[PDB]
Amino acid sequence: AMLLQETTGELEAAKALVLKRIQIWKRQQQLAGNGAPFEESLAPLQERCESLVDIYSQLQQEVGAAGGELEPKTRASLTGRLDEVLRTLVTSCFLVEKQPPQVLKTQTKFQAGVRFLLGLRFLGAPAKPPLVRADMVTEKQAREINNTVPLENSIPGNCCSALFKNLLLEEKCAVLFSASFTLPIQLQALSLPLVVIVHGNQDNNAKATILWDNAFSEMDRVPFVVAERVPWEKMCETLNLKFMAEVGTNRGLLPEHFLFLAQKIFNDNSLSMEAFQHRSVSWSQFNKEILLGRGFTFWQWFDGVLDLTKRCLRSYWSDRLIIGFISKQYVTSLLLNEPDGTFLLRFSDSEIGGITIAHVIRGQDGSPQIENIQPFSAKDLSIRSLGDRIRDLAQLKNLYPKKPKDEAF
After folding, report:
1. Any idea where the SH2 domain is?
2. Residues 236, 144 within the same domain
3. b vs e for 75-87, b when ≥16 Cβ sit within 10 Å of the residue's Cβ?
């Protein structure tokens, strides 16, 4: 037989590869929710999808107008496969270009955006634009106002998107976007989980559950399952990214900071980072269990640091003037033998989002002792700068190590 159906299998394989390129784009977009690079456009991806449709076009006219003329092998058993290649590709093109706010207040106006990749090839000028409906569904309904926007095209933009500029209203519920279409096939697009806050108490547990979803999700997800015992290396990586992103700095967390954050989260005084690198970290350990002796979970404390550092310590963290994540065992280790007045800047343990000035003083007996000045929260730092306050304290002379106070600040 003529049957060179290996070019159909080539299209079947190239379509499978394009489907992964889209899958990967959605994961980069999901990681970007927890402040991450990504910044990838759907424009080159759309070009790859156009090429698949172009290959499907040539392959469809070759089958039907055959030379060898074979029946159900080069007709029914061959057209059914090519039909699937278009059916699956078209459904894997109705995406969410701009995601809705995952931390959503149940009244504020939120913007949304969906993009169809094969719109410039399937929706011409005389063809009517399909009305897209954005109905909110829960985690159960995921497994199958102002929600009506027509899918329009663009000549000086080369796209077929649909922006929903106006929209008003542990519970992961996402917005389902859908539209009617005919070559009479249907299109659907599900967004990333959204927790709806009422703005009465606090959104702390919503930000923590979104952070855990976006970072610790699989590409082959069943909306909306998340692994609940991730390794510490991945959590450190995520915490480092969320730090640099929320704080707005390029100077990130380093191995020593991580060791402290591990000693706090596990309530373990171990010193080897080996006995911490490959270790399980549950969602309970992260935002359920209250820290020993404290009235808050680990995420509540880390979020306070992000709040404080972003708000008033943005400059000093970047300047590498704040150690921040250091155990009292290590502060004594360095500062204790340095000359009097040598100070250091670290984060308050007992108080949520505070910065204490640890410094070396002379004890009652004369031997060096470690003194910690009362911590400054963002409210005290709004009244007076950290550098201004550090200047007001005459006992403070040099920031560790051996670096004049007035020179550093």
Report:
1. 301-409
2. no
3. eeebeeebeebbe
